[PDB]
Amino acid sequence: LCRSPEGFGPISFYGDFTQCFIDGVILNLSAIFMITFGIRDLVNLCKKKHSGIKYRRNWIIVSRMALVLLEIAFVSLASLNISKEEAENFTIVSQYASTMLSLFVALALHWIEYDRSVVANTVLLFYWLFETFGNFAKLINILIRHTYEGIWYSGQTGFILTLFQVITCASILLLEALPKKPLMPHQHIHQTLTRRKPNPYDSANIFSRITFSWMSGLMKTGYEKYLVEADLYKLPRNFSSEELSQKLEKNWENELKQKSNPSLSWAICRTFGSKMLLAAFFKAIHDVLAFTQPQLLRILIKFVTDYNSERQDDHSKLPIVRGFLIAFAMFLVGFTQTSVLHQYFLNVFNTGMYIKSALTALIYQKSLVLSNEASGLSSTGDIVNLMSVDVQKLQDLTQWLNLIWSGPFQIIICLYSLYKLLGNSMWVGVIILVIMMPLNSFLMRIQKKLQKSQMKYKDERTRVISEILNNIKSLKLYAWEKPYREKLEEVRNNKELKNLTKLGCYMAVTSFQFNIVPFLVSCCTFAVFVYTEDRALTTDLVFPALTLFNLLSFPLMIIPMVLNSFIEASVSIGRLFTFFTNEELQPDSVQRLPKVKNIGDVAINIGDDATFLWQRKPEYKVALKNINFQAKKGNLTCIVGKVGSGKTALLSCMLGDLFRVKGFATVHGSVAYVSQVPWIMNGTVKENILFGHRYDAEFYEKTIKACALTIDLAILMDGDKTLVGEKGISLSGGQKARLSLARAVYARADTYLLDDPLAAVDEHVARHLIEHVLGPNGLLHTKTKVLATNKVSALSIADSIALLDNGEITQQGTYDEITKDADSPLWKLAISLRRASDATLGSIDFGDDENIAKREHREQGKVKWNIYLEYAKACNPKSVCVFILFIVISMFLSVMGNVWLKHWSEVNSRYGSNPNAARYLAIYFALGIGSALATLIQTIVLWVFCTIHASKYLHNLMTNSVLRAPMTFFETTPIGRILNRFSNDIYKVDALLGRTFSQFFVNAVKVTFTITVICATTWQFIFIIIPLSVFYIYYQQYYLRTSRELRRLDSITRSPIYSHFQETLGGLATVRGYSQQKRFSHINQCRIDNNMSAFYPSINANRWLAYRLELIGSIIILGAATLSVFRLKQGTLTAGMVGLSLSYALQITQTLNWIVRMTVEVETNIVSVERIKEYADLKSEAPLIVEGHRPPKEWPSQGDIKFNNYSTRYRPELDLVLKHINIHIKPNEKVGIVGRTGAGKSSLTLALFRMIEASEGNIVIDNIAINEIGLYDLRHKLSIIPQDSQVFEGTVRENIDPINQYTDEAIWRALELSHLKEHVLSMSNDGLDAQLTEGGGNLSVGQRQLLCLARAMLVPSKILVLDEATAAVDVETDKVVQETIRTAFKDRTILTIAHRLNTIMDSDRIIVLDNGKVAEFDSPGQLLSDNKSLFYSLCMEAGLVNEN
Ligand SMILES: N[C@@H](CCC(=O)N[C@@H](CSSC[C@H](NC(=O)CC[C@H](N)C(=O)O)C(=O)NCC(=O)O)C(=O)NCC(=O)O)C(=O)O
């Protein structure tokens, strides 16, 4: 018991703690805490082993030990000052006896703490915090009792002792927290490391873990230079994927073998779940502290009313210190509420990083054991979506998982809180929510329907654009850009840009409907209160209630969204459980034994009439039967058989794929294998030869010289640095087979299985390989080798051979017996190089961003203010002003609604009843509805008038410029980068950029009106908000620069995880043939860890920002509450002013954070306008039309061509390729153009079509210089048979005449002349309206050539050019072309460019070209009669001279 006039009640009359509560509870629990935990920690640290790390003794530990020995002196002196009256009180005398033991424990613990730990001990940090707080409360408690009652409750001794006793504890706390221990001067050589430096999270004390201050070192670095992958720290302890997947495998395997009904989700839950049970505790404590602030607001308003009232009655007892203490509790609640929420976010964000790394690494190691058929059940492009999609949805689910119980909890607390203020009137708030929640969930479906519809038209536009960009060479010649531009423009304008406006309207209606509900609940609740209850509606019922209505906004929004992800994640679990249960290879299928010793040894045995099964299910199929087979060292063993017999099955047996039911098999030593179809990995040719082995130069050069590869390296003129694969340059033919054999031979294995490689190559090359590799001559003299082939030479040199058919062996022998006795279609047609060593493992190197940072280094804040003005002029600039005005109107009316509510409450309080309620209520309804209509109008203006006009303008501007670029742009730029801008960058401008400007401006005006409402009541708030603006700018500038570089460095690393999986899916027979599984798993795990070490600091920068921007809001609440109580003393404050001011300040803490988060979404998306405007201003070409010079309709009436000293070059920086050409062609003449390879023949037609400009001279046709003519009027008239045959989708009529200039009769006549009519009619009865698939898959190459000939047939002209078409048109078609030249084109002048001299022997005259100079121009007969002439020498090179 306490012998005191004030009891154990926590709150005194003056508003602070009673003395009995301070002494008996707060300063006792913090003593028992240290007694119980310090002994345990002291034991565990004393049992710990000695370690070599030692810290030097220094002033730190001397100071700590000096300070802690004064506390015992002050408690000692204070314990004698006790008077005779106080010693009969149990709670005060218990205090010193409880404290004095814990001081001795702490003094002991500092000593062992200094030597045996790296980080400041946690219990020491919390004990001194509690003991500073408990003593400061006692100092305040003595002061206010002195001031009001006039006596010292304890003499000046106890006061001055308490004053010293606070300062000593406060000094100990900071000497514990801030300084760091110096290491000894020696044994510090472990700092020398070239790798990344260790992560700073592992050495932070608990106060730095709570405030995230360990992250401040990276922000100063990223602010002053571009980050690159050499700056990132290592991952922490226990984040490695090899560690993580070995936990989950044990639980899943136990799940399958222990019990009858497995499931995957339970195995996931029981291993990672234990942290998400801890996250629920912090979520519940936050949800309880959130709903406390309206109770302190109710208490403060009622205190203002009582203090004004009794003073005014005294004009016609409560202390002022009670007002200053409530304003301090409103700061403490906000500080604790901030401190627990981000410890919830840390624990939920780490579990997604664990789940992703466990599942990805189990999927990869699963794929290496799937049998042939289960691997055949699905697409290679589809198993990769298990990584790209399915684990991504399981990652994103965890951030929402606790809201399934946290959502209803807040809404039940809110309804029960409103029940106590207002009574039975509350129930109208339930019915409106019951009506309007299903309507909103109904509206959320039709948007998803429209959004799924929108995604098709993207693909249709992308396909049309890609098909234009591939065939640009034909478009340039035929002047066909006019139909295809309109064909694209029709699809762009008349579907997609219609569908956008519909989606815009459906978004606007949903924004209105979601805005109006929390107003409508309050208006109906006040309206039902006024007409039924017999009570005055006063200020402290009205202004606390608004905050409780407004807290219902967030849980109503988020409840429908979490259900969608919960349904969506349920399919993915079933897909992964399907995948993990497939059938697996039989382990026992073949034995593996060590090497043989001597050349007589048998290497392999199969016998006892073994049988092997092609499949296990649904019915097993007999692959092999009665097999009895052997092989010996050294000798070449070959096997022959029909295609589709057991030939392939023996090789598949010896690799161990098939299922065994009878017999036995064994293989000695290592196996090297070559697949029949080659597999080429992405990399250098050097690495494809080495394939993970060490480098020995002599054996390497021997291996290359044993193959034809050396000349192939010489011909390409590029060494082993040439990239090869899918994205390298395309090798062809026997080169791949030669490369595969070169890979295999370098391994020096003890058994070779060769699956018929010789079919790909020349026969003399095969002879060369039989000289240098196979037989007794080559390097493989002592290795066993089995080659399955049908080659007569190989079976001639074979030492033993056997015949396999129908799955059974029928004959075998040496070939002498076969020649003599078999009468069969086989006739009736001691030392070696030691194994190469394996290279060692390590880490996968990163790339260097220097290649782009050298351009970026000229500035930071690299997006200029110009691009914002370019986008705001693509939008009509009046519409932006009309968009801005209505945000201000909407916020102004909402503020005036609450000023009217304040006036209504002040009128009700004076009367004690509710007069004129129907008059007062209608104006509040009007001001509340006029604020929703203004929110509707701005969204209609934004979607229909601002955005669609920009999306209309930009694409039309870009396409016109791209379609008129000269050929150099298309030759130098890879098409995979041109198509990206048409596909992704237009999409971000269409759908995502417009929304973030809305969410920026709507939140930015709200805090300006909030600060105006606060400053209008107490004008001294000016001096508070001005120094807080400088910190707000300081933090925003540090976050902006660093976060975008961390996001980019994340993004570039994510793709190479999946390319490796797609590359390895194609090669499982090779990888399993060389036993490279361990290396191929290790590469994948390094690829995962490189991504996670860049994803880890990205999410922690958000927590670092948010703690510091939410701490400003609590100082704003403290300052606004305190200045009103300073104003109350002057006698001027009233209850309505403090209610209106404090109801706004409590709602500001999230907006300050969301503005700075939206600034980076604006800056990320605005780059797309810069990249579009890059291509818009691209360089021009010569004019299409020159109006003053336009030739008559029939201008080429004579086919006469004249050269006037013409010269030209491909590019200005290169040499002249044609020089001083003077040539004259007679009308109707048939000219042969021929010359040596690379002499510059192809430039002639580009000069003729003016695709290249003149450097000197000119070309003249029929008394006009062609340089004066517009390019369309020039290129329209010529006729060309191009060497490239190119097909477009759509009708045959579109492929012949897309302009509809000509009748069907001419079309059918041309098709009749081209022999095409019979084939198309068999395809479809539609005739001309029959449609051709992409790339002309229905047409053979000869059909494409005949189609091009029909295209040339339809165009009337006096001139034709056969521009090198003989490079693809074979003689079986060229005979028809010759007949067509004799019959139809006979009247024309014809220029023919020859692939071979045989095709042009009927030429009237020939021009010989050599190195840009005219060699001779003479008749063929005079050349062929001059045996020493140049053309005669060319015919001798062609062999026609010797032929005749
Ligand atoms: N109070 C929140 C805590 C914060 C929170 O959960 N934030 C979200 C962001 S939702 S962002 C969605 C949006 N928020 C805002 O517009 C900001 C709040 C507002 N301006 C205010 O005045 O409080 C909204 O839903 N507005 C509805 C409304 O206007 O009432 C989150 O999970 N962030 C984790 C992360 O991303 O790291 C809660 O109860 O959980």
Side-chain angles (χ1 to χ4, degrees), residues 1024-1039:
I1024 296 179
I1025 199 64
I1026 288 175
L1028 291 173
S1029 303
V1030 182
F1031 291 97
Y1032 192 76
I1033 293 165
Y1034 172 85
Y1035 291 130
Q1036 190 261 323
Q1037 212 79 22
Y1038 270 50
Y1039 179 74

Side-chain angles (χ1 to χ4, degrees), residues 1327-1372:
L1328 305 182
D1329 291 342
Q1331 300 193 358
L1332 296 164
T1333 62
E1334 181 171 294
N1338 308 86
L1339 305 183
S1340 70
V1341 180
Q1343 287 279 325
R1344 298 172 210 170
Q1345 291 170 358
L1346 292 173
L1347 173 64
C1348 295
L1349 182 63
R1351 287 178 170 157
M1353 174 66 70
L1354 192 62
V1355 179
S1357 64
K1358 189 59 178 176
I1359 296 171
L1360 280 92
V1361 182
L1362 183 68
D1363 191 357
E1364 300 188 53
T1366 52
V1369 180
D1370 294 321
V1371 183
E1372 57 263 39

Side-chain angles (χ1 to χ4, degrees), residues 283 286-287 290 337 341 344-345 349 399-400 403 406 410 514 550 552-555 557-558 999 1003 1006 1099 1102-1103 1110 1147-1154 1157:
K283 186 57 165 182
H286 165 92
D287 288 2
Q337 185 190 165
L341 178 59
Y344 157 84
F345 280 134
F349 270 84
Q399 287 81 340
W400 309 116
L403 302 184
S406 168
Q410 297 177 30
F514 196 77
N550 186 72
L552 288 184
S553 182
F554 186 85
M557 185 201 75
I558 205 152
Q999 291 196 273
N1003 291 296
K1006 179 179 174 173
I1099 53 170
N1102 303 336
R1103 314 274 73 87
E1110 294 184 326
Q1147 303 182 159
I1148 210 177
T1149 181
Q1150 294 300 325
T1151 303
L1152 296 173
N1153 183 24
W1154 197 238
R1157 297 276 257 110

